[PDB]
Design a protein around this ligand. Structure first.
Ligand SMILES: [Mg+2]
Ligand SMILES: [Mg+2]
Ligand SMILES: [Mg+2]
Ligand SMILES: [Mg+2]
Ligand SMILES: [Mg+2]
Ligand SMILES: [Mg+2]
Ligand SMILES: [Zn+2]
Ligand SMILES: [Zn+2]
Lengths: 221, 80, 113, 202, 63, 127, 97
RNA sequence: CCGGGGACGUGUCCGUUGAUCAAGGACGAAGGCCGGAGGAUCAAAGAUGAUUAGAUACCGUCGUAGUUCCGGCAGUAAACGAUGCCGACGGGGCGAGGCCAGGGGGCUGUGUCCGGGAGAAAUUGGAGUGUUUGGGCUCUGGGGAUAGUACGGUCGCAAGACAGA
């Protein structure tokens, strides 16, 4: 069992907030056990790259393994995190909880028309990490994920099914090539389209809406 | 702050060409010599000496911008 | 010699928890320390009880900004309650400089340069 | 309508030298300036603009359900009792001295509560808190001087913080409007005895 | 999926922005007391760090 | 410079800066109908020309729903079957966006030239 | 990379600054790049000032100052320690103490 | 003395006369070359005295070309901001420019500091407004080395230069 020290996980353990309305009001997920509680069924961890970094000290090269991992549900949510540690299995479970803290929603869209369920990225966007430019392009249905091996693993966990991609720069740098491809999905999802031109009246955010309700849960313990 | 309606405070600060409508800082005027009954007329940013013809004194001398007026002269702007 | 954090953080806790039972003389200050703690080796008692006296000398002057003692804020709040010579009564026909009065021309009183 | 300043309250801020603003003003501050003293080269702050930013700050303060969630901070020792007399009165959590960085982000430390608002005495003196608040989606009211920076500050209260009485007057008046917003106490406060607790006397 | 439109810019608030702040303001009575209803305000990240969030919120709440 | 491309860049600078009005120091005949076409799709709210007997002045109110406006120089001769390929380059998605052609029916949108059976010269875009 | 924003010298909006000779090395350094230390000290050193009071003809004699502009090239200025070893962020200091 | 120059100021004139450039032309530090004049200092070359394992160098001394001027050639530099020109737009602060205004002002130069944006990063008011990629125009680059070398060409008294595998 996990004890939700964070205030948002208090409302998550109480089931006050769904997954989709965390990112509605832009509340930072401090603790990783929030989203594994919400996505207890579907959450797949997939290791992108294990590589070993070194610093030369006085005696010998201090070598440590640096892993970069991607987590995601079946469709809609994806995150990436990286941790470097002395032994790789310590680094992976540290990277996974960092990825779970950094899950972002990916809005999917329709390529041409609104029939069926959504399958592709909604707009054309570009994620740019250091010197790696990944550009996602909406693809018609059945086209599949047209990408390299590392973005396709992110694209599978993000739940897109048809995408055309373009890359520039040093895509062998796979931490940058993974950080760019989620940044495109980050940017294509919050592209401001005429479907969302409709102004909604703003709503009170749930952590200050349930601001009375959280303090008794600490007073219970 | 509205760009289509610039306040009268900001218009005199900004450049004459950079206003919403290009507005002159110059004008014309009348110079009144005391020994002399006529009123010689001249430009504000004048580039020529102006002297009252009879009872000959020098009214304004040209300068870098506005012409500086010499001696005892009453000036009146001319706008209408 | 220089004490370490195993001694200093210890001796900080002794003077903080048990201040009134202490005194400036070291041998009495050690005699409380066997009575009130459990420290195994007799040299390391003298390491701690020595620095307790080096603390209790400067906490008698009240110099340390960290530790906090129940007697030392109730004496402080007597010092805090100054018999107030607030200048709101001491200033009569307030001299405000030439441009400072002009900003208060809507609702004004006590006009002086 | 607009709430009018008491002659009692405006009596305080002139001898607080809160309108004695600073020698320099930024273009973000010029709307808070009626004029500047041509003698001392000191910008004199608008009191009417100062008072209405106080009531917006009071409006923003009470809007949270619990005032104890609000973590008010002051780096300097001038406002040590100005925040101590504040939090006994308003029922908020005080932060005095050096704000330990990571105080809102690092979850290994649980000294205070997760903030839903912070208000600081000075963005120059508490640049660490106003940055750390922006990492956790937390609003920031600030008392801000004429020379001071105002980035990552939601509500600027244009007032001086370089006098010992000045933040003592400002934290007093911000406590005065708060219970006036709740209707807990009107302006019938008799400042003869109250504001001196906020004052820094030593 | 829905994203918060910032009130002052009119732009959507960017994806997972920490500087983005929820702003709550109670409506004010005629005598100056608090009321139960609340103005709810959405603020983009970059307009805070520019420092331009102050002067816009002055004129919006002056209305 | 090019007065259309200078107009589109100066709009984008004010748009990215969250400004609500942009004063542009010049109007032409082609950027008048470009901003009026930008208005009817709701991308810009308040449009006011100013006749100062020189180049011109237009003050564009920024609606907040303009991602980017641009100008395509040189104005490529495009047939009917090419503008469907050209809109795929320029616009982000098929569901929205406006590619503007200077065809014989008028300065019109890429959706309309499909309807009006027109080609013409590509001027710019917005979305 | 570019180590200094001014490239070591104070030359801006010039093409050419005339060279001067180093006071220690006789190197040809431009007047802008050259380290210049204007020293104004007394002619008689301060140890001997009591001995000149006993020896002056004049009541209230003021010992004259010595005026010299030491102009050093870069190589000898660090060797004569006219310029102090500073950090990379310490390089951007410009004020004298 | 003759000549030039930009900025500012202006109800002065003309009215699109413009921007950028193959070709072409002019200028172009130092060193160099030619003819003439001159020659104090310094000083390639050269000569020495030392240093050194050696020392054709660094150090000392001397010394010619040269450094200087006039007429010409040459046409190169880390000729650098290692950043083409023109144009639109874009944050604050501080400075010691010039002109104007007299209302912490405007134009135009010029540095600087902090941010924004950009960038592989150093950094950067352009190296920003770039995959949401299109302002015009000119030039250049396409892994290293061969090599800025050879051949052919043009220019030069020559040195060599341009160009260029
Ligand atoms: Mg040069
Ligand atoms: Mg020469
Ligand atoms: Mg020569
Ligand atoms: Mg000769
Ligand atoms: Mg010699
Ligand atoms: Mg040849
Ligand atoms: Zn006369
Ligand atoms: Zn030297």
């Amino acid at each position: 069992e996990w004890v939700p020290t964070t205030d948002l996980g208090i409302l998550v353990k109480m089931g006050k907030i769904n997954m989709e309305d965390i990112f509605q009001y832009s509340l930072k997920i401090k603790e990783s056990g929030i989203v594994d509680h919400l996505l207890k069924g579907q959450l797949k961890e997939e290791v992108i790259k294990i590589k070993s970094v070194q610093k030369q000290t006085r005696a010998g090269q201090r070598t440590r393994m640096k892993v970069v991992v991607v987590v995601g549900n079946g469709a809609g949510y994806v995150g990436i995190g990286t941790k470097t540690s002395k032994e790789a299995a310590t680094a992976i479970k540290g990277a996974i909880e960092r990825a779970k803290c950094a899950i972002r929603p990916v809005r999917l869209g329709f390529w041409g028309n609104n029939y069926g369920k959504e399958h592709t990225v909604p707009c054309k966007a570009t994620g740019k990490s250091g010197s790696v430019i990944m550009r996602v392009i909406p693809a018609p249905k059945g086209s599949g994920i047209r990408a390299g091996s590392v973005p396709k693993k992110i694209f599978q966990l993000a739940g897109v099914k048809d995408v055309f991609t373009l890359s520039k720069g040093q895509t062998s740098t796979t931490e940058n090539f993974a950080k760019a491809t989620v940044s495109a999905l980050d940017k294509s999802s919050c592209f401001f389209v005429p479907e969302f031109w409709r102004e909604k009246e703003p709503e009170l955010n749930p952590l200050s809406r349930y601001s009375r309700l959280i303090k008794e849960y600490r007073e219970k313990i | 702050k509205d760009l289509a309606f610039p306040t009268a405070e900001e218009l005199r600060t900004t450049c004459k060409r950079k206003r919403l409508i290009p507005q002159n800082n110059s004008y014309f005027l009348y110079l009144r010599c005391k020994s002399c009954d006529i009123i010689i007329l001249a430009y504000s940013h004048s580039q020529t000496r102006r002297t009252c013809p009879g009872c000959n004194m020098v009214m304004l001398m040209p300068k870098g911008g506005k012409a500086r007026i010499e001696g005892d002269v009453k000036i009146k702007k001319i706008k209408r | 010699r220089v004490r370490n954090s195993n001694v200093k953080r210890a001796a900080k806790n002794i003077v903080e928890k048990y201040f009134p039972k202490l005194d400036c003389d070291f041998h009495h200050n050690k005699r409380v320390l066997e009575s009130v703690t459990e420290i195994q080796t007799k040299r390391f008692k003298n390491q701690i009880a020595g620095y307790v006296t080096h603390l209790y000398t400067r906490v008698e002057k009240g110099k340390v900004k960290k530790i906090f003692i129940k007697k030392h804020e109730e004496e402080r709040e007597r010092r805090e309650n100054m018999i107030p010579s607030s200048s709101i009564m001491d200033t009569e026909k307030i001299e405000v400089d030439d441009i400072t009065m002009q900003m208060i021309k809507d609702y004004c009183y006590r006009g002086n340069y | 309508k607009e709430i009018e300043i008491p002659e009692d309250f405006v009596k305080a801020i002139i001898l607080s030298n809160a309108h004695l603003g600073s020698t320099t003003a930024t273009t973000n501050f010029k709307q808070y300036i009626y004029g500047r003293r041509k003698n001392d080269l000191i910008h004199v702050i608008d009191i009417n603009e100062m008072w209405k930013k106080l009531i917006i700050a009071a409006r923003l303060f009470v809007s949270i359900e619990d005032p104890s969630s609000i973590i008010v901070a002051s780096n300097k020792k001038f406002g040590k009792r100005a925040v101590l007399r504040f939090c006994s009165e308003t029922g908020a959590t005080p932060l005095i001295g050096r704000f330990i960085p990571g105080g809102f982000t690092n979850q290994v430390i649980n000294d205070v509560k997760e903030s839903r608002l912070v208000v600081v005495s000075d963005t120059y003196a508490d640049k660490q808190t106003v940055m750390e608040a922006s990492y956790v989606n937390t609003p920031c009211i600030a008392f801000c001087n004429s020379d001071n920076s105002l980035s990552r500050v939601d509500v600027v209260i244009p007032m001086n913080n370089r006098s010992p009485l000045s933040i003592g007057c400002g934290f007093y008046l911000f406590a005065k409007v708060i219970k006036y917003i709740k209707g807990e106490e009107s302006f019938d406060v008799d400042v003869r005895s109250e504001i001196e607790l906020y004052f820094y006397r030593d | 999926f829905e994203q918060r439109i910032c009130t002052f810019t009119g732009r959507p608030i960017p994806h997972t922005d920490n500087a983005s702040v929820q702003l709550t303001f109670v409506e004010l009575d005629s005598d100056g007391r608090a009321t139960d209803k609340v103005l709810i305000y959405n603020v983009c990240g970059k307009i805070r760090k520019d420092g331009t969030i102050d002067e816009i919120l002055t004129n919006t709440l002056a209305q | 410079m090019n007065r259309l491309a200078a107009t589109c860049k100066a709009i984008n600078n004010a748009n990215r800066s969250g400004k609500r009005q942009v004063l542009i120091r010049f109007v032409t005949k082609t950027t008048r109908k470009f901003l009026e076409k930008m208005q009817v799709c709701g991308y810009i709210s308040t449009l006011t020309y100013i006749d100062d007997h020189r180049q011109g002045k237009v003050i564009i109110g920024l609606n907040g729903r303009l991602n980017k406006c641009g100008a395509i120089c040189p104005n490529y001769c495009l047939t009917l079957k090419d503008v469907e390929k050209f809109k795929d380059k320029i616009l982000p998605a098929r569901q929205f966006g406006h590619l503007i052609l200077n065809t014989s029916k008028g300065m019109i949108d890429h959706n309309e030239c499909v309807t009006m059976k027109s080609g013409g010269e590509v001027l710019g875009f917005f979305y | 990379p570019v180590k200094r924003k001014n490239h070591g010298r104070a030359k801006k909006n010039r093409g050419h600054v005339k060279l001067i000779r180093c006071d220690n090395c006789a190197s040809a350094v431009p007047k802008d790049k050259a380290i210049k230390r204007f020293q104004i000290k007394s002619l008689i050193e301060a140890a001997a000032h009591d001995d000149v009071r006993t020896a002056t003809i004049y009541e209230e004699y003021e010992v004259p100052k010595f005026f010299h502009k030491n102009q050093y090239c870069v190589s000898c200025a660090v060797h004569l320690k006219a310029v102090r070893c500073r950090s990379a962020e310490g390089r951007k200091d410009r004020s004298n103490p």
